[PDB]
Write a protein that binds this DNA or RNA. Sequence first.
DNA 1: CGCGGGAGCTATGACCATGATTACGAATTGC
DNA 2: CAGAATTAAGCAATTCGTAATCATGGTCATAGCTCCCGCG
Lengths: 57, 69, 65, 57, 1006, 436, 218
Amino acid sequence: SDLKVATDNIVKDLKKIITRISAVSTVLEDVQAAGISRQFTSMTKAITTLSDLVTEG
Amino acid sequence: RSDLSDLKVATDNIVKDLKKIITRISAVSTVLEDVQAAGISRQFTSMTKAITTLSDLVTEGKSKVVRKK
Amino acid sequence: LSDLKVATDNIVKDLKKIITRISAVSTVLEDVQAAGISRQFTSMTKAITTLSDLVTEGKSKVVRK
Amino acid sequence: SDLKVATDNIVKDLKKIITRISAVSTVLEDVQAAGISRQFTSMTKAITTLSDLVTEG
Amino acid sequence: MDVRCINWFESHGENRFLYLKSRCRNGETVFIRFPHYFYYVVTDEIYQSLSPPPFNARPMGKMRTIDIDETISYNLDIKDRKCSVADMWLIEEPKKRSIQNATMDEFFNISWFYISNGISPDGCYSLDEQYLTKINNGCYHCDDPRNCFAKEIPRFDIPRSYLFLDIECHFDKKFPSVFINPISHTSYCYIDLSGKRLLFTLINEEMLTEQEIQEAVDRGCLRIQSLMEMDYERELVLCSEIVLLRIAKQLLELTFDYVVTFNGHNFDLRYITNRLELLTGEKIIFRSPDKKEAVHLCIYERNQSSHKGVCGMANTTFHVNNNNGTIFFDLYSFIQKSEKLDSYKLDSISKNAFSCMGKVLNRGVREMTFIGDDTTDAKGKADTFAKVLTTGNYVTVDEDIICKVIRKDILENGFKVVLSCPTLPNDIYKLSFGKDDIDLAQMYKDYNLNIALDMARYCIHDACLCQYLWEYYGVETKTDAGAATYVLPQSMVFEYRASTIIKGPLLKLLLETKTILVRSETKQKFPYEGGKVFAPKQKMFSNNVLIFDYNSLYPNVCIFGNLSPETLVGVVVSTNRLEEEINNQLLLQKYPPPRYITVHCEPRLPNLISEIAIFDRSIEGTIPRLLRTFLAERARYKKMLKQATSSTEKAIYDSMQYTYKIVANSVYGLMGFRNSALYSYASAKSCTSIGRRMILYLESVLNGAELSNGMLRFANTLSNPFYMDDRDINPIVKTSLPIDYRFRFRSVYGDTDSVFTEIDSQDVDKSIEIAKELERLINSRVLFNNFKIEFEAVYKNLIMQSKKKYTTMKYSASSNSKSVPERINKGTSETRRDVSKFHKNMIKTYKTRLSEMLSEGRMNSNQVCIDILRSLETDLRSEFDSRSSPLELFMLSRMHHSNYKSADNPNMYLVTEYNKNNPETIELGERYYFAYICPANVPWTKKLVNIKTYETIIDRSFKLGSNQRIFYEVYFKRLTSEIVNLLDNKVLCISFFQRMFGSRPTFYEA
Amino acid sequence: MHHHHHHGTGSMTSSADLTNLKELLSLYKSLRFSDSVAIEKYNSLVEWGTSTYWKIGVQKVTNVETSISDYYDEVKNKPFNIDPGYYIFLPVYFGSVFIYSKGKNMVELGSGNSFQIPDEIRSACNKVLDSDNGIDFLRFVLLNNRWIMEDAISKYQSPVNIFKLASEYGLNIPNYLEIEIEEDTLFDDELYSIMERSFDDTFPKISISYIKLGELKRQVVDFFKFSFMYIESIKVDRIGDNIFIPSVITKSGKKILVKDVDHLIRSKVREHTFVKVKKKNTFSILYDYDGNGTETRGEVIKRIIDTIGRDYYVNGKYFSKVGIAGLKQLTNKLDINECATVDELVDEINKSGTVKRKIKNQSVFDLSRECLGYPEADFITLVNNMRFKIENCKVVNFNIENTNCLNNPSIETIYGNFNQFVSIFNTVTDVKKRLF
Amino acid sequence: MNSVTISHAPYTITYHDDWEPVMSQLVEFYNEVASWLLRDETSPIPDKFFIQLKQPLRNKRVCVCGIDPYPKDGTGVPFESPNFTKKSIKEIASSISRLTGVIDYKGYNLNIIDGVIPWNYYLSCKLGETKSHAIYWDKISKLLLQHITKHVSVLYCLGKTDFSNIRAKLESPVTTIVGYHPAARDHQFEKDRSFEIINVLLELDNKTPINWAQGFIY
DNA sequence: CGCGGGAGCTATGACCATGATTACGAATTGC
DNA sequence: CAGAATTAAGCAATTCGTAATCATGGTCATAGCTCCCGCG
Ligand SMILES: Cc1cn([C@H]2CC[C@@H](COP(=O)(O)OP(=O)(O)OP(=O)(O)O)O2)c(=O)[nH]c1=O
Ligand SMILES: [Mg+2]
């Protein structure tokens, strides 16, 4: 299961990233937060494509 | 990690690591396209649960930085 | 087929997807190697070497001269 | 058992690629030949990087 | 010698005096000159503290002094309200002086003259003659009014003198200016002491050629060249304008009791005195009865600022600077203060006042012969119509067409009139004396002798119409009762509003109850919740609704709980439920429930959660027994209304009792009014709170109440909602009704004191005498102390579109099932003055249509929405295209004031623009007709903006231009939103309103 | 009937109405540094002047942004050249900047609310305003439950003579120096640091404000570097009895000072996060920034009380811990000798006549609320959801009906200590009955 | 600074450019009132009825309004008498003397004050008569005070009885001070301190306070 | 072979226009 | 000798018009961002 352990490492890295997002996010400036919310909308688009590939095939 | 002067290098590191994560998510998606076009029989219910936890964690990380005023 | 423009566009537009999938295989392999699980890469090495020498003979056969 | 069949499908796709290049390669014209030559150098650079990944241990 | 007080009137300048206008039994007018001097009330130590002694000082006795200030007390313990009893002396000075800590400064010197000398201003007195000192013929001087005005003999009828007048002036422009336009006619109604009513009209002879002047002499009119040639007996007199003005001047300088005009201080008397100053330089000189000081007729503007909002100037009344005793009375100002009508132009007042139903005996091609008597309409309405028909010229039929009177006959018990009317099918039509339907400027452009005599007839109709409005409103009876009740001079009665007219009986009471009200701290205004209004249970009531109306609810609240500023023990407030509970229990143990009433009220401040007001009922306050005086006056005029038979006297006495109800609710409202010195926020707030708890109590008792086996039971017990009372609380009440009458009552609507009790019976007579039994049983058991209700009406087909808005058929308690109902509209489009007559007419017709298709029940709701919206579609498009209906049935109206928060308010800007452009100056408080006017090339407008910019003020001389048109779209928008408020299928209504007016319709939520 | 005017006009022109107009102008010039009491007085004078004169130049205000930045220029974060002349160097402290208006009540910058102050320090401030009527406002700072008079902005008198008179009056002033500047010298971090060391003040100073003698306008200078430090834990240490200042401890061990509670809630400080801290060589200064998280203020209160402890609650600007309340806390709040029984307490309040005046003047509920240190609005909100059974104005039984207020953790903590509140309430009730 | 022709005795009347929006209506009103106005001997000369039409309205922030000129010796400028015999300007000078602390003066003149336009509501009166030309000057007085109170910030009225209607005679909001007249009895004008109230109400409108010492004639 | 110049696609935050919601005051009346 | 002199009822609730505020959508800069070509 290379795919499963690859996605497990992906979600573990992203869990560490979201913990440091919670660390830095209280005092993120406006252009900072705009950029990281742009990247999070890119996140939602990418996981939408990934969900479409695991659903439709 | 402790006593950093400005957030700009910290957020730039955040953004660069997240570019790497977007690149790796697009990579795993576009190799999933290839293994689905190969025609091998797969069962991806646990994969669907993994992307469900992925979407919940991305929503949790997003909701704190969405809106100003 | 006339004027060979469509053929050149067709053979250009797929190879960027090819190198995108090759970088995808590289990044999934990096993701496996950074996960810490024990792996052997013998048949994959054989597949990459036969892909490489087929690519080099194609490169020798696609020369402008 | 998924990455191996993924590279096998990649090998079959490049088999189709090389057969169609050998079919059309009786005339290629110089600038598109140079473009696909730089594409093949980028291909060999990516293959060399992946070979370093598979041979680093 | 016996006199009756006609008028009280004060002179100013040099030596200052007060005068009485009085009439003896033989008919001689007798004047009594009193010294008018300032009145102040100080304590005994303050009275000895003035180093300058007063001119006169006589003792008022030991009178308690109450500091009427409201302090919220978070703790239960309250300082006793100050009750400093001190001997008080009446400081009487001819010159105004400022006294430190002087009390009772809110009252006028004239009321203080009345009450400290014991004089009722409407009373008959045998004057003790040696106190009177004869100045000259007809004028006396009384230094001691206490001993002279000691014998109050009862009423005797006096030869009361009158002068009713309007004038007409030549406007080649829209409206006459004084300087460029002459007087055409001055019509006069000279009622002297001998009692004969001389009806004469002075006609200007510079407006006619000598061929027409000698033609008028041949036709019977009298041509004069001087004052001594003038004969008052002649009906029509030709004269020059200067001689006409001298006759006007010498008539106005006569010591009449009343010179009565309509819009005449503003126009007629001002025009007469100014045109007299222009042509000959003379002025109308009013002399004092002692001939000491003489003033000229100068119409002084008087402005009353509003008491809400930004306190801008809201009403302008014009009066006459008189000092001969004549009550120069403008009926325009009086009917503006009294009546609630769309406009108070004289022809609209004649529309409303002299409206009679007329049967038809003869029909012709162009002449329609109407008959009216005691069978056609109410008794006395036909005398009033015949009285106006004695000088009337044009009669409006069914409020839409104006018909000239062809021939006049006055019957014994009604009228007989022939009208230039088109032939109409119905036999009974409404006849009113409103409009002339003429272009008066057009008749001024082509002036001849026949036109001069026609406008002489119209001018004498207006002059006698002043008398017919005088007798219709009963203004001398209203004046006498207001003078007696409000302890005010007869010329002062209507001119002041509630706050002054309270003070007269208030001063009578505070001298009787030996009490002085003072204030230490400033009065602070808080919003408080008023009387409770219940949502209607449903829109249509097929089933009969009983109306139960408290007898003067807020006065009976104030009398019941002794709600006065002076009897408020204090205000207990709590920010928290802890000190609320502590104060509640410790409040019950400190203040006993019989002697003290605790009113749980609504908090004045947001941090407070409870505001309990405590009132001492051991000694009766000045506000409650002042209300006892006012409801005594209302009760005696109500029982004079009950004994009244003619409709004119019935209308007079109904307006009397309504006025006394209004001034009793003003004794209420002055406690809610901050700038009054009777301001008591706890008393008015607790008055609304007790009225709220009483309407909640009467509702909860009547809702879910059923009648069974001759026994009436209620849902809730009959407990006094504020304390335990000695009367039994058993809802099981024995009736005097038959056993088989088993009917269930429920409350469907309640507005403040009026619970709407839906009985399940539809029989009218049965519901009426069951409801009289209910009124007796509630007044005997459910209510307590002063609280009484009256069964007013049975409401059939009660169409409640919202709160405070309902249309129904009323059957009164005197009326029966066979008796004709009176269609009562309350707050609907027919009542409201900002609603055009076309809007009222289609709301009435579509109300009739909706009522009959819902009463038949044949036809479903969605398709009745279809056909009534399609009928609306064809009616509104026919009105937009054909434009057959005139401008006068699209005229809105509103009151011109200055009370505007914004400097750039569009209504105020509209009136200022019209005052700049037009020779009409719309005064403050004037009701002007305005309509939405747009150019006619504008098509149907979907989305409506700048609606206030399309308003154009409509005048009687205003004519709609060919390029202009009525902006039908916004009238139709209001009409459509009311219509879709009436009926169901809201989604189709939204689509219909969106396709016709581009907007979502306003919808009521129950 | 014309003798009662066309429309009666008040005596606008009288001298008392001129004093009202001059007061209206004075509080119009003082709008940005007045309390809600003077704002309501200004609105009363505006509506009086609008009912009295048909227009006035000033309008009613619904809310005034309380800022004193007209007197106080922009804060310079870079070194600059100071002009020659005489200067009054005054240190700006860390706590919330308060301003004392001419209406004898204390105003909060950024909120405009009137914070409630002890009696002696209000009496000293009122006597300072009685000494000089030209003072616009007195700039104060509330840090660690201390009021330091930072500055005395006045039209005529210099603050130096104000400060010594306020120190004689009992007010707290900095050890300030007044010096000449001989030459154009770059106002750098070293001269700033020795200026701070010249300010012999134990309590933290974040910046320096200097006043020119030639110009009335004064400017705050501040040299710092912005820092973002990881947070180990959040602690409270006790500055007065039942009064706790919030404090923030980093992973390195250096302690970030926190201004008030509402600074900690507004900036949304969470453990294991980054906060904006102004860095000095001596201490750390938390920035007055708004938190960028989506967490609502009530949930920040949730998390902060959950991290610190459930029997801590928010009491205005300081945290407060609940405990078993008795006669000791009531005698400490009454500033009187420690007492064993309620009878002896009645006796000593009778001995101290001004303390007896204080017992008579405020109610039982306000006394029992202040003795346990409950807040105004939170405790009114808690009691406004409860029904009480009561004998003799004493709570025998207390119960709550609505539990929506228990989502507030301060209200929940005060509900936890409501038994001790009932005990002190019955004690103060018995005291008020036995005195009166 | 323009002149418009009048049919009657003041044939040329000179108005400043600030007065221009209301002159087309003033000529219309004056051509109907003047034929009856000029029969009576007017206390100001008709040639100087409109000499305060020459004053600009932009620099004026205070309108001081009397109801009419003096019954005798009206100079056309309100509250000016070169002989200084009039009691109204004498009490005005007394009030300003207490204001400005100026005891030495020979006359007072409100026209020379910057920011103050002395106004008479009714622009004329008969010889020995007060408010005699009221009916002639009602419309012109309304229109002209409408125009003044658009430009000035504070209106000061010198009559308690005479200016009781002044909130109806005006319809645009202006700062209106209905003060006691100087010739009023009880010395109520001595008692009131209205000229400080003018300056305080200007300070409320962020206008320049009137230096009332400019009015003194030395 | 490797990085710079250039160009095109594409989400994405900010701004603006349009229309629906709502406070807000006048007008009116009921009470 | 050359004017002043106080009044003034409350709140509830509906409708309608205007204007500030906000939901929704269209549009436009704008950074990501990714590839095509190219020149040393
Ligand atoms: C008319 C009016 C009434 N009120 C209050 C006061 C009481 C209630 C009920 O009075 P209502 O009109 O029903 O009649 P009511 O006064 O109770 O007397 P009747 O029902 O006629 O006997 O409303 C008021 O404050 N101002 C007013 O102008
Ligand atoms: Mg009633």
